[PDB]
Design a protein around this ligand. Structure first.
Ligand SMILES: Cc1cc2nc3c(=O)[nH]c(=O)nc-3n(C[C@H](O)[C@H](O)[C@H](O)COP(=O)(O)OP(=O)(O)OC[C@H]3O[C@@H](n4cnc5c(N)ncnc54)[C@H](O)[C@@H]3O)c2cc1C
Ligand SMILES: Cc1cc2nc3c(=O)[nH]c(=O)nc-3n(C[C@H](O)[C@H](O)[C@H](O)COP(=O)(O)OP(=O)(O)OC[C@H]3O[C@@H](n4cnc5c(N)ncnc54)[C@H](O)[C@@H]3O)c2cc1C
Lengths: 340, 340
């Protein structure tokens, strides 16, 4: 069975690894290749801080809540492992701040120690009257892509740098199954008017006294259009930009100033922090993830496709449950191939 | 009024600064000098990680609970200030772990967000069945001594390196008031059989993914004779040694191995952490702090003394309330000097 995974961000690499681990067998070996136009450190996944946190609103597809919890439980089970440093995986606590009262999120029982903030805690944040505290996990995107890449490479998965122009192009080279993990660019291989870029910009700063994340919200202005601060292993991410429809892969000074001034109002100690770097990326925004099989006609043959794209601002948070779901769909293909 | 403060750890410098700020006036200037045998980075204060946390047991003198709370409230009021980075001051959350249930500490309402740990949190710690989570503050000892030293120096307080052999020696040089802030060595200037060294040893390690403190307890073996892990700004402190009566200022390999093996059992990710440094210091253990006035006969004159020593494993935690108390005692001296 020749499988091609298109895409080498967290979704494509985790899906490739899950297909291999579940379905590369002694009596049915797979040949798996990854085709991608960009690899680490140059994907969207590489821009993400990697905090596990779904959106505040309930997902349109309720299975996505399961996939996020599966990812959390999976990662939590390994956070105290000696492997965790190579994954970029660690525990972190922090604040979610609101102007006024809001209902609890659906994921409040997935994270550890979820509670409302107390009055004395809220006194630390002059602009916010309500919020949460909990403990979650960070899975840093660059690190984890590097780790996934090493695991794939040691299992014989080969990687090729190319921009694919069509599913037919890949089918003509002999793929029996294509897994489409192309993030925000999926529309170029098959039009999808529900998929749009949600452009974000972040700054990385040296602020090693910051031991908590701090996410603020202004839901009417949209998720992530409010300051956020997320300590990583080496540096702290500052952000708070979400611009639907904007395809400019270029840091801009207006968004720089929005991020800096908003995060320094939130946390005045950041005025002393050295700015290390700045990045832009495109969240693959869709009303729900597209995670589903399709049969495509590709010249003289049909080809099986699994789509796995549209993970918005939560691709690291949900990737493992999606990758397991994609591998289940792959097993349905194999079961049907026996019954030819 | 000529004042000599003996001692340049956190107690002596904070007391000197509080006396200056409260009682150096236009119509009554003070001349304040600090005499010390060791200055930063070579004091006990420099060895301390600086987590605000009193002992678990209630203090013999209940005023000490007030002094600790005053210190916490003072520091918390400045933690989001642009001055905080120069003090070495930041917020941190973390765990206190026990084998079995224990009553809540008296300071549970001083810290932020105090709660019992949940079952799923306790599942992360195989050896512990009970514990707490809260948010506290770190005030790093070296940094804060440097900061106190700059504040004193800009106010004209002069520092002299010397070992003082007696209070009479200092009185003969013309001191009207001596403030005795000599930590564990106070017994050399006036015998105090209740004051003893509580020797500790720590290791500093590069583990920047550690965002929480983790303190374990085995109360029958004594406070701090159980593993602890405390992230600082740059490095993580590992410890867990408290040896009453031991005056050896020398890191030893047996205590090294106790610390390392106990902290790596607590947190297996530390097995990958690079060891940076190792230090020994002496906690000034006393059944209560000695914070009180004495009149001493010093040859032809009497001299006023304020004692401020005996702060055990909590000198950073309590220092500001003690320093304010010492300055109140200093004001009683001035009031009596008017009534000569
Ligand atoms: C500023 C920002 C912060 C974020 N923070 C977080 C966070 O803290 N937590 C969280 O859960 N998520 C976060 N996210 C979201 C997360 O980054 C995305 O959901 C996730 O990276 C999407 O992964 P992906 O693999 O689908 O896409 P990508 O990482 O973009 O990978 C897509 C791959 O497809 C390839 N490709 C596309 N089209 C073609 C083609 N035609 N031919 C060949 N290759 C092709 C690309 O080259 C690339 O290899 C953040 C995103 C942004 C922008
Ligand atoms: C391993 C360890 C970890 C700790 N962690 C923490 C923590 O996280 N939080 C917390 O609250 N506390 C902590 N502590 C406790 C804290 O370090 C002490 O309580 C505090 O430093 C005592 O301060 P001090 O100024 O009295 O003593 P010191 O810092 O020892 O200063 C005493 C001064 O007196 C001088 N001196 C003494 N005798 C003479 C003399 N005859 N002539 C001249 N000078 C003299 C010395 O040279 C020195 O300048 C820790 C202590 C240890 C050992």
């Amino acid at each position: 069975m020749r499988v091609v995974v298109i895409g080498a961000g967290v979704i494509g690499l985790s899906t490739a690894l899950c297909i291999h681990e579940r379905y590369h067998s002694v009596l049915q070996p797979l040949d798996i290749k990854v085709y991608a136009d960009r690899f680490t450190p140059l994907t969207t996944t590489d821009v993400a801080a990697g905090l596990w946190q779904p959106y505040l609103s309930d997902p349109n597809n309720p299975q996505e809540a399961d996939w996020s919890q599966q990812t959390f439980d999976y990662l939590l089970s390994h956070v105290h492992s000696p492997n965790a440093e190579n994954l970029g995986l660690f525990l972190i606590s922090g604040y979610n701040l609101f102007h006024e009262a809001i209902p609890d999120p659906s994921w409040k029982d997935t994270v550890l120690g979820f509670r409302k903030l107390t009055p004395r805690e809220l006194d630390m944040f002059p602009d916010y009257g309500y919020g949460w505290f909990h403990t979650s996990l960070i899975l840093e995107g660059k690190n984890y892509l590097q780790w996934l890449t090493e695991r794939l490479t040691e299992r014989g998965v080969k990687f090729f740098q190319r921009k694919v122009e069509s599913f037919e192009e890949v089918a003509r080279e002999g793929a029996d199954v294509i897994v489409n993990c192309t993030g925000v660019w999926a529309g170029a291989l098959q039009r999808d008017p529900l998929l749009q870029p949600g452009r974000g910009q972040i700054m990385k700063v040296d602020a090693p006294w910051m031991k908590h994340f701090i996410l603020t919200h202004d839901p009417e202005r949209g998720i992530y259009n409010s300051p956020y601060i997320i300590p990583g292993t080496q540096t702290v991410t500052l952000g708070g930009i979400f611009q639907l429809g904007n395809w400019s892969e270029l840091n801009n000074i207006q968004d720089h100033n929005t991020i800096w001034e908003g995060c320094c109002r939130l946390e005045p100690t950041l005025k002393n922090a050295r700015i290390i770097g700045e990045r832009t990326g495109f969240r693959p925004v869709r009303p729900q993830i597209r995670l589903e099989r399709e049969q495509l006609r590709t010249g003289p043959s049909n080809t099986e496709v699994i789509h796995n794209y549209g993970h918005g601002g939560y691709g690291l948070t949900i990737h493992w449950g999606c990758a397991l779901e994609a591998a289940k769909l792959f097993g349905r293909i194999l079961e049907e191939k026996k019954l030819s």
